[PDB]
PDB file of C-alpha atoms in Angstrom:
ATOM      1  CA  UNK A   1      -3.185  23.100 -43.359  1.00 22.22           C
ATOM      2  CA  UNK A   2      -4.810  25.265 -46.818  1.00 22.20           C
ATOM      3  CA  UNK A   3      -8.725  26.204 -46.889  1.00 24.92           C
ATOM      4  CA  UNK A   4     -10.310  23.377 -49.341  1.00 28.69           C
ATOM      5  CA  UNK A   5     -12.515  24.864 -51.245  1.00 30.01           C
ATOM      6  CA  UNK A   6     -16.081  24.507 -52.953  1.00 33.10           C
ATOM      7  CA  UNK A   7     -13.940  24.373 -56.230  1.00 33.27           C
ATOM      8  CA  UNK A   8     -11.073  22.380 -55.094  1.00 35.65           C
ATOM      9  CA  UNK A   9     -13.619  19.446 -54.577  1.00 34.14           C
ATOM     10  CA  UNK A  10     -15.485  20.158 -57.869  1.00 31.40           C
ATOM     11  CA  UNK A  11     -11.394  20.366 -59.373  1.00 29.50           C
ATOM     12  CA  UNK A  12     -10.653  16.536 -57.454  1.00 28.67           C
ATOM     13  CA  UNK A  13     -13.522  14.750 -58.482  1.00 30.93           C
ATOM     14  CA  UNK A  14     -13.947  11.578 -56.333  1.00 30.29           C
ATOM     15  CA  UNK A  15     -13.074   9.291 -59.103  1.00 32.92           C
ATOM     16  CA  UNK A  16      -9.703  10.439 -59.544  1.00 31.92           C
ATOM     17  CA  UNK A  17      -8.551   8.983 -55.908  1.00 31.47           C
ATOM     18  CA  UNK A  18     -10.707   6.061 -57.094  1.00 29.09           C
ATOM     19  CA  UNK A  19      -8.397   5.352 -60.539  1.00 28.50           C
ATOM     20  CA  UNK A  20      -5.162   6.443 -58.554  1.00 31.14           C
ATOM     21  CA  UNK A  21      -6.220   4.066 -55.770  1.00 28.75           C
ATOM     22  CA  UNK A  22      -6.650   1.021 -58.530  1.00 31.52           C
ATOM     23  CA  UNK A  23      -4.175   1.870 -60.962  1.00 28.71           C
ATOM     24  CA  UNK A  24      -1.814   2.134 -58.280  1.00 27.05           C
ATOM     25  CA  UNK A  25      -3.204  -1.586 -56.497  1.00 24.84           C
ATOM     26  CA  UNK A  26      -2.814  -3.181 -60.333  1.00 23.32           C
ATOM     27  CA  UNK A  27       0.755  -2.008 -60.574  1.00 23.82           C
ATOM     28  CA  UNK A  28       1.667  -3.642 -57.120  1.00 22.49           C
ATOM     29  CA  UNK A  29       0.328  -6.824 -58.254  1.00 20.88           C
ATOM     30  CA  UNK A  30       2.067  -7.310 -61.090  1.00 20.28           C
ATOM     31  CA  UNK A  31       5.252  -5.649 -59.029  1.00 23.18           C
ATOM     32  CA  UNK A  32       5.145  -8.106 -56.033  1.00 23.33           C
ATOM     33  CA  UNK A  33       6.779 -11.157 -58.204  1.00 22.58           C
ATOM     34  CA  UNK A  34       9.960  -8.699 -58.686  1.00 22.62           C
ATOM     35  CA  UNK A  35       9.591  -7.502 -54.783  1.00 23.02           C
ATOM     36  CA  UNK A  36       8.957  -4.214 -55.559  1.00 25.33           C
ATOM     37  CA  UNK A  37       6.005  -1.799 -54.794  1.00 27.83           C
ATOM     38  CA  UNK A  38       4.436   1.235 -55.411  1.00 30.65           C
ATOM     39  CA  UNK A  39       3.423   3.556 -52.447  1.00 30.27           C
ATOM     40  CA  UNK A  40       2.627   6.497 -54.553  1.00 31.00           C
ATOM     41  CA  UNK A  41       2.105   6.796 -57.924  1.00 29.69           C
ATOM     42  CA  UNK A  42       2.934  10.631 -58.566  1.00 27.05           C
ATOM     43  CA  UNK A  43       6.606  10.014 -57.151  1.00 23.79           C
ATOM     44  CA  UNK A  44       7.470   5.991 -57.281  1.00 23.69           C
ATOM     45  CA  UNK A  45       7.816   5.757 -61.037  1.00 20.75           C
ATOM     46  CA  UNK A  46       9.658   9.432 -61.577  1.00 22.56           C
ATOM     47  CA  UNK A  47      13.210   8.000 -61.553  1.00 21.60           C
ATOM     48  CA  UNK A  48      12.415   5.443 -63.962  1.00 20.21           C
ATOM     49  CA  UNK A  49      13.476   1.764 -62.135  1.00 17.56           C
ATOM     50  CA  UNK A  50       9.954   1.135 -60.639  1.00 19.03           C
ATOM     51  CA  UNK A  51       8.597   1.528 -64.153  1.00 19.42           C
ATOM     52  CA  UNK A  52      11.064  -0.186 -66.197  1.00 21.78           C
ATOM     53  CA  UNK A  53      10.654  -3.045 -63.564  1.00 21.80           C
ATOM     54  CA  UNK A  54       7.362  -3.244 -64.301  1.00 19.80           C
ATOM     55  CA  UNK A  55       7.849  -3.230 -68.013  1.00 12.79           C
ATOM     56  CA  UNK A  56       9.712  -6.356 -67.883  1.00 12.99           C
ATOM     57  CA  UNK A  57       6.920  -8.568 -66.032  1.00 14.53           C
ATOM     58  CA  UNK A  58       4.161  -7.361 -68.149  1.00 15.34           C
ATOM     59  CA  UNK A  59       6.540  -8.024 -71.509  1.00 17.16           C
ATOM     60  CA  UNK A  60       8.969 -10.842 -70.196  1.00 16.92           C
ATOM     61  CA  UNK A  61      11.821  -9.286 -71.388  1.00 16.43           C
ATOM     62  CA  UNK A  62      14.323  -7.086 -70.715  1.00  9.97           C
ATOM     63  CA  UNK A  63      15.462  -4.102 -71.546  1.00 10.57           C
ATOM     64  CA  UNK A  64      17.791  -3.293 -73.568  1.00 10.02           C
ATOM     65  CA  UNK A  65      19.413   0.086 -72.967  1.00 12.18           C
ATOM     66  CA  UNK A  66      21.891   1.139 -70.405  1.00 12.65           C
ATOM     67  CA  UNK A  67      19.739   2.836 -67.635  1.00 11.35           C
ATOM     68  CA  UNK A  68      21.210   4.566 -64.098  1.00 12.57           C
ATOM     69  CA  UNK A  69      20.572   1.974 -61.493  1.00 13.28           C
ATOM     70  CA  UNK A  70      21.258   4.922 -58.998  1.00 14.74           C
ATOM     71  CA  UNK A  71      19.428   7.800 -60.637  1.00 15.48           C
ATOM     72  CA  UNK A  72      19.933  10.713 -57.476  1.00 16.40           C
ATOM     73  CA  UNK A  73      19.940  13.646 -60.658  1.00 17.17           C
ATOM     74  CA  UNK A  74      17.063  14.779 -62.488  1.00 16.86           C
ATOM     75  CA  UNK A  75      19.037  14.079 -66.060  1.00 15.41           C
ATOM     76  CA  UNK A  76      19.570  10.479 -65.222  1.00 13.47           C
ATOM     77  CA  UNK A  77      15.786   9.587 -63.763  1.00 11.63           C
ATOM     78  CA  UNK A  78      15.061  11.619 -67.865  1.00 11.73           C
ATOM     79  CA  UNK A  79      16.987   9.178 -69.639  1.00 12.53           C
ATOM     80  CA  UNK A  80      15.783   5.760 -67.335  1.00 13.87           C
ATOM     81  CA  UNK A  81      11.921   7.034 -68.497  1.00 19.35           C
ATOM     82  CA  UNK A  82      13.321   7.313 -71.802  1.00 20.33           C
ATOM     83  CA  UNK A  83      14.465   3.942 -71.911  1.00 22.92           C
ATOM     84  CA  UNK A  84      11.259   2.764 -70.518  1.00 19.37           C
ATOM     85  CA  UNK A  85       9.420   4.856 -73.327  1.00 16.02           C
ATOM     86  CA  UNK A  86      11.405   3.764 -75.922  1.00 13.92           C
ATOM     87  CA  UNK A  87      10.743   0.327 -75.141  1.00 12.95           C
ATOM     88  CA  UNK A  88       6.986   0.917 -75.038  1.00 11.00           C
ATOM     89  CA  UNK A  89       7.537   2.773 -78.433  1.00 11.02           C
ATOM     90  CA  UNK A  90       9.341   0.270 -80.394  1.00 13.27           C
ATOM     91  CA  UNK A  91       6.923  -2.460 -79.025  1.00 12.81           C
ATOM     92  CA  UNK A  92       4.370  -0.932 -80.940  1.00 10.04           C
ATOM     93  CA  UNK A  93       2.273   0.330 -77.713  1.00 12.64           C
ATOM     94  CA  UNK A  94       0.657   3.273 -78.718  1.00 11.38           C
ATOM     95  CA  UNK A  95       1.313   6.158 -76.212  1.00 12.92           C
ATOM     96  CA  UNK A  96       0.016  10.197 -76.313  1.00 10.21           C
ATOM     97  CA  UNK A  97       1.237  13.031 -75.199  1.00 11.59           C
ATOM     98  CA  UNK A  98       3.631  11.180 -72.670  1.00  9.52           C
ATOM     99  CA  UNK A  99       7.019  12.040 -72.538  1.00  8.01           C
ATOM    100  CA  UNK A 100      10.348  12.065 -70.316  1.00  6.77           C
ATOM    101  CA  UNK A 101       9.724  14.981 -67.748  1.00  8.75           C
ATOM    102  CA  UNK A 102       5.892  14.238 -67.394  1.00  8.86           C
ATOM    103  CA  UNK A 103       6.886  11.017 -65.577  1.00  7.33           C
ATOM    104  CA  UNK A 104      10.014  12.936 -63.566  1.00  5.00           C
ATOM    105  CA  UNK A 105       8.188  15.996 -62.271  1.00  5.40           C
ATOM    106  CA  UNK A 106       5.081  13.944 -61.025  1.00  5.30           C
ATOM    107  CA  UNK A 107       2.864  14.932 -63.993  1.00  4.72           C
ATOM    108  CA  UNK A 108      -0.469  12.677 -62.357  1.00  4.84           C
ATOM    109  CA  UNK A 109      -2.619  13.338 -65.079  1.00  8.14           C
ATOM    110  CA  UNK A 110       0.108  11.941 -67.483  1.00  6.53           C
ATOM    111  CA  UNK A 111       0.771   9.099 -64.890  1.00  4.12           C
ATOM    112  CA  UNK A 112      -2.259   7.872 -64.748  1.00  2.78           C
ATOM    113  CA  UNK A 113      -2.254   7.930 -68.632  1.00  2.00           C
ATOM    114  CA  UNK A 114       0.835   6.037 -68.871  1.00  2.00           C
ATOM    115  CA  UNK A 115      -0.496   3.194 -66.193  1.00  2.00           C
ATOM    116  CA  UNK A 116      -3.782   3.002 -68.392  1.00  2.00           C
ATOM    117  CA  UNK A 117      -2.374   2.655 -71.604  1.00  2.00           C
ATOM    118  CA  UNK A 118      -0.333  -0.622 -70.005  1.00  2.00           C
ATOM    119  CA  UNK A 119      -3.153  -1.592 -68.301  1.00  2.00           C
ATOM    120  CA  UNK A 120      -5.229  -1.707 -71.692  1.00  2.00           C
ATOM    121  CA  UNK A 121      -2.578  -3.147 -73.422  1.00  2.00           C
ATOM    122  CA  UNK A 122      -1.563  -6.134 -71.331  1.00  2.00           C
ATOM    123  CA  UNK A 123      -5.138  -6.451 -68.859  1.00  2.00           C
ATOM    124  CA  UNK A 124      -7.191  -6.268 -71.665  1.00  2.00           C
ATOM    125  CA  UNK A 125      -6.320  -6.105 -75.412  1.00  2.00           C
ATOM    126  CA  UNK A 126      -3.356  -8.783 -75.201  1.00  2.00           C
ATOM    127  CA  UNK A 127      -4.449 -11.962 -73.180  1.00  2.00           C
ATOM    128  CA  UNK A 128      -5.449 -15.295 -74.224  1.00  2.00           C
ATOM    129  CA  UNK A 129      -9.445 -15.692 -73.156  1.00  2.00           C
ATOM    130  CA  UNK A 130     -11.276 -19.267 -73.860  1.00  2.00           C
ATOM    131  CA  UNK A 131     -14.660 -20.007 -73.570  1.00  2.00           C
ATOM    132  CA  UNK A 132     -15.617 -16.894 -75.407  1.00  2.00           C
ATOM    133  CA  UNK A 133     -12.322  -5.646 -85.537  1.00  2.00           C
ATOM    134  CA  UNK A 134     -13.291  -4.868 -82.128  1.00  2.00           C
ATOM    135  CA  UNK A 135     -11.892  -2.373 -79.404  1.00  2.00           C
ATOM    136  CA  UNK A 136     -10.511  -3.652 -76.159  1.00  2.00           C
ATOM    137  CA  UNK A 137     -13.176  -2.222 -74.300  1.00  2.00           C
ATOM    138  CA  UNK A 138     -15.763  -4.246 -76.397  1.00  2.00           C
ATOM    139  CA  UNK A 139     -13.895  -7.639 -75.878  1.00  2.00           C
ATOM    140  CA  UNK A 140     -13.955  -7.065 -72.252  1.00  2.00           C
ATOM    141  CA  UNK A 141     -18.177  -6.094 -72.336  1.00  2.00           C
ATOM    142  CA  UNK A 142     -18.841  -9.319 -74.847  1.00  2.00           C
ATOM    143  CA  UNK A 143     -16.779 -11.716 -72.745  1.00  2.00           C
ATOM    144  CA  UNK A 144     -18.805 -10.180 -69.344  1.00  2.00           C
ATOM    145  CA  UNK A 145     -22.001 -10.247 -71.329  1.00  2.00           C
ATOM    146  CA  UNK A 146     -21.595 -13.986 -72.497  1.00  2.00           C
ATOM    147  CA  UNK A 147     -20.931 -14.847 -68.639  1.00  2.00           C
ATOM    148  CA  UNK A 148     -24.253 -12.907 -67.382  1.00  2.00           C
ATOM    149  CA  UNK A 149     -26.488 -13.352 -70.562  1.00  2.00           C
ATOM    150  CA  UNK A 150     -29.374 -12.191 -67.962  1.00  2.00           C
ATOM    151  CA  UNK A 151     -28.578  -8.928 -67.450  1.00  2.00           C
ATOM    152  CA  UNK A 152     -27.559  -5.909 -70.562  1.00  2.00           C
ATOM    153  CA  UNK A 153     -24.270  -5.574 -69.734  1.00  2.00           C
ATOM    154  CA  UNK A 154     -23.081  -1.887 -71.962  1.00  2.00           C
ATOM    155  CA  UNK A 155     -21.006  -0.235 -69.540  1.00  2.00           C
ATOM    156  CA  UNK A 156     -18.511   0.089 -66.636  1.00  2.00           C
ATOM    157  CA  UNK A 157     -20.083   2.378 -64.402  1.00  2.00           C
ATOM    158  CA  UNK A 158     -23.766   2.465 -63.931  1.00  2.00           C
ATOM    159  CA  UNK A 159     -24.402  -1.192 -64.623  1.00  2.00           C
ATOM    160  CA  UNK A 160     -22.162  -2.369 -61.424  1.00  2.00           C
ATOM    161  CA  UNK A 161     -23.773   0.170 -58.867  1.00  2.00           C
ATOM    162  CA  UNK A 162     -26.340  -1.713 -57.307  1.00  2.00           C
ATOM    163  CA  UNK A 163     -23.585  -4.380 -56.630  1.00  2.00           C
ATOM    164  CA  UNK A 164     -26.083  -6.949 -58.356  1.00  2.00           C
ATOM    165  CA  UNK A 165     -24.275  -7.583 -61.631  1.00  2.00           C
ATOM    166  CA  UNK A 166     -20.919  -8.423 -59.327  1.00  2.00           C
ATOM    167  CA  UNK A 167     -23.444 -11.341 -57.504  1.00  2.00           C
ATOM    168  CA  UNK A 168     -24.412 -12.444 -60.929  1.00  2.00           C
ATOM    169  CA  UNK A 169     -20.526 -12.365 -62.653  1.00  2.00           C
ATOM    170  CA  UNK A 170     -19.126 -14.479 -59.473  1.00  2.00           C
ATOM    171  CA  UNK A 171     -21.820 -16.985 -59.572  1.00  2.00           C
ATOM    172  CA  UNK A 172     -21.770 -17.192 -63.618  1.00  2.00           C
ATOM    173  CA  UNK A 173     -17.783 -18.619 -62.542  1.00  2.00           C
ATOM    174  CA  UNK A 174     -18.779 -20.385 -59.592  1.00  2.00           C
ATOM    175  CA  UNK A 175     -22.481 -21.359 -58.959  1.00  2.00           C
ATOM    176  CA  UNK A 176     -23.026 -21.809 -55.423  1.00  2.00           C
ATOM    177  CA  UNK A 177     -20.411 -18.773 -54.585  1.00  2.00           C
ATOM    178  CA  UNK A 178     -23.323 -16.202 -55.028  1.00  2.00           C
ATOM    179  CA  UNK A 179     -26.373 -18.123 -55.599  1.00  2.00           C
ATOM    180  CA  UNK A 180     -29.052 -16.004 -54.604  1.00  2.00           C
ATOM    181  CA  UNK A 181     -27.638 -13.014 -56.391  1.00  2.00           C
ATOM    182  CA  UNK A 182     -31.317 -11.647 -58.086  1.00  2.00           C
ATOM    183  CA  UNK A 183     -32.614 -11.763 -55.065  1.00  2.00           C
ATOM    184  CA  UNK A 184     -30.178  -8.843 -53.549  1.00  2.00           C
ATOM    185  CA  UNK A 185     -31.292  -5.647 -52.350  1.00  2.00           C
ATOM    186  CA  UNK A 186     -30.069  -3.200 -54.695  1.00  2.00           C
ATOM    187  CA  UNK A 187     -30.618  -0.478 -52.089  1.00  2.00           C
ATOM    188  CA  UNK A 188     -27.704  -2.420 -49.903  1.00  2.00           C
ATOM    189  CA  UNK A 189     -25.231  -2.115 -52.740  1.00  2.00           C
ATOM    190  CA  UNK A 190     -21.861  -1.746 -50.218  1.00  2.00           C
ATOM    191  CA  UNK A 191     -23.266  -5.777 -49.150  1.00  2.00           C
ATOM    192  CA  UNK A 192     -23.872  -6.859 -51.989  1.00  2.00           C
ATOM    193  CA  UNK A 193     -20.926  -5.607 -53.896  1.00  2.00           C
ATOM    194  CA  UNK A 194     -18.105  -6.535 -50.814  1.00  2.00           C
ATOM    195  CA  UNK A 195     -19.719 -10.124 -50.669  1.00  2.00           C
ATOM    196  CA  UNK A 196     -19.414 -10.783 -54.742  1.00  2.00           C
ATOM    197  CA  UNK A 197     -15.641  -9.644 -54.368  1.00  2.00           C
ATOM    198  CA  UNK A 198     -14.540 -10.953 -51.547  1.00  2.00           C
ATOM    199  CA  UNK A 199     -16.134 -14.340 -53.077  1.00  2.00           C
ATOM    200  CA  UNK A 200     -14.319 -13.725 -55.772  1.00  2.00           C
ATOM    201  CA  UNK A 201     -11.081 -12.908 -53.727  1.00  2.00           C
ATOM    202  CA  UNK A 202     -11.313 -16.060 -51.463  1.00  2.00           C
ATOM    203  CA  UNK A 203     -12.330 -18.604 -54.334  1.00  2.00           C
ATOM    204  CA  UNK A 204     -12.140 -17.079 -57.941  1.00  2.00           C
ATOM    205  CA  UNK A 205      -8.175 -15.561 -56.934  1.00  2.00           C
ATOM    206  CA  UNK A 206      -9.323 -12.072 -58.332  1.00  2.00           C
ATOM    207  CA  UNK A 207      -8.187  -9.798 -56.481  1.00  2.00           C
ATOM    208  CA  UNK A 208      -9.780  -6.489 -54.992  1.00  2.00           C
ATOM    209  CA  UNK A 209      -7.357  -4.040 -57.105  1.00  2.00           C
ATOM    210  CA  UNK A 210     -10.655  -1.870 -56.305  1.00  2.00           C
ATOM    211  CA  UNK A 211     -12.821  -1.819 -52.979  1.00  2.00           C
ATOM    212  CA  UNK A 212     -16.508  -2.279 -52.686  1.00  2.00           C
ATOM    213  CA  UNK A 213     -17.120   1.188 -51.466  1.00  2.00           C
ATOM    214  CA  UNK A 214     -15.074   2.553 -54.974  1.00  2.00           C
ATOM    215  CA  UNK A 215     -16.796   0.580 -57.294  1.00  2.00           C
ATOM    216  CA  UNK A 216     -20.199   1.522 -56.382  1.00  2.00           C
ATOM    217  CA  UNK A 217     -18.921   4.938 -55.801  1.00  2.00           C
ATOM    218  CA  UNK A 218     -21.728   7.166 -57.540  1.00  2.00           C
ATOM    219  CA  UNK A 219     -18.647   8.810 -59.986  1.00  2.00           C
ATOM    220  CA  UNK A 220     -16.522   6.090 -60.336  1.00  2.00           C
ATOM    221  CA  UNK A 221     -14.903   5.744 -63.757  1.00  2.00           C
ATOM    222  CA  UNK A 222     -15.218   3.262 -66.033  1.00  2.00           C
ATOM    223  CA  UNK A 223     -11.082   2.688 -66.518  1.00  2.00           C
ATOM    224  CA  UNK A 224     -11.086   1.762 -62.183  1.00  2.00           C
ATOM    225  CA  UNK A 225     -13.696  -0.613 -63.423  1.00  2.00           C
ATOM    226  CA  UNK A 226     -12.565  -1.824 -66.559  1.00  2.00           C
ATOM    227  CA  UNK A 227      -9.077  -2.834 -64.783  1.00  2.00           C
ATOM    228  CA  UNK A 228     -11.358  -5.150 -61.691  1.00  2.00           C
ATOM    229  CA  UNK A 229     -13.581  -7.017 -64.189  1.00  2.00           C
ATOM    230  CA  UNK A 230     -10.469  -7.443 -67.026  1.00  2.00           C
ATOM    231  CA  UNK A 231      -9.019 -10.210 -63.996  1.00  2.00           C
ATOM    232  CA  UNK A 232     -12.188 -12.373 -64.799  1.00  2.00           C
ATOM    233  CA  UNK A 233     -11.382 -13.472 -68.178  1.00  2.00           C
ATOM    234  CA  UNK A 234      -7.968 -15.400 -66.697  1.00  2.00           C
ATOM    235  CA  UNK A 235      -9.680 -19.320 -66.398  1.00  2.00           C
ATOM    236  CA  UNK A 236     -13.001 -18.248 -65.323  1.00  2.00           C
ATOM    237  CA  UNK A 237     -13.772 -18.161 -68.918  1.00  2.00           C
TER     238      UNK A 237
END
């Protein structure tokens, strides 16, 4: 239907698909349990239940305001976000710039802010990791780094995009899963990165909450990545 333009692709850079596509796979795993799902993430958490839903599997407990379990007008989806940002608030999980009618009126920037902050909360900064002060981001990179004490592990972006590190953090888990990891093209990155995760998939039960093709994507962002690699540190240790 409309013209895209040379700035309208410069104005969607590819990693934004990438983090909605993985923010949005994250929240339907933790959803499925409650039989609930996310289709899109701009409009599926505007009236509030999706969201509060999820609160209560990534807390275990429950709410505990009054909320509009039918929420057809705009001033009862406001108050169930409120609830759900209330509970965030009192729970001592640090939000910005994230109110009420962000969430309603499909605010994706916002959205996507929101997701992340529970994300690094409960993915990352929260669970219990054996085997192995300090931001969440530099937990995650030291527990990856003691795994794969091979390579210099210092980011979420670059150091994944040959698909070689992936090899080396499945087989770390599981020798005999990716065995002959160093040995990988790095020029076949697609391979190399779809075999790691689908080994990891199949055996490791980490699932692809991004694809192959996104993770090597040449702009990916390190959040997409952060939220993949944070599933490691459950028993593979």
């Amino acid at each position: 239907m409309a013209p895209v333009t040379e700035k309208d692709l410069a104005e969607d850079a590819p990693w934004k698909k990438i983090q909605q596509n993985t923010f949005t796979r994250w929240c339907n795993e933790h959803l499925k349990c409650v039989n609930k799902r996310i289709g899109n993430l701009q409009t599926d958490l505007s009236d509030g239940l999706r969201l509060i839903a999820l609160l209560e599997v990534l807390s275990q407990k429950r709410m505990y305001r009054k909320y509009h379990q039918r929420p057809t007008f705009r001033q009862m989806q406001l108050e169930n976000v409120s609830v759900a940002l209330e509970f965030l608030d009192r729970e001592s999980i640090k939000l910005v710039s994230i109110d009420s009618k962000a969430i309603v009126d499909g605010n994706l920037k916002l959205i996507l802010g929101l997701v992340w902050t529970l994300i690094l909360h409960y993915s990352i900064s929260m669970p219990v990791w054996e085997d192995e002060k300090q931001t969440p981001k530099q937990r995650l990179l030291g527990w990856i780094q003691n795994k794969i004490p091979y390579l210099p592990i210092t980011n979420f972006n670059q150091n994944w995009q040959d698909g070689k590190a992936l090899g080396a953090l499945v087989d770390s888990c599981a020798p005999g899963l990716c065995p002959d990891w160093e040995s990988w093209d790095p020029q076949k990155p697609v391979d190399n990165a779809r075999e790691a995760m689908q080994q990891a998939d199949d055996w490791l039960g980490v699932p692809q909450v991004i694809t192959p093709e996104e993770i090597i994507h040449p702009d990916v962002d390190e959040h997409s990545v952060m939220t993949y690699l944070s599933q490691f540190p459950k028993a593979k240790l």
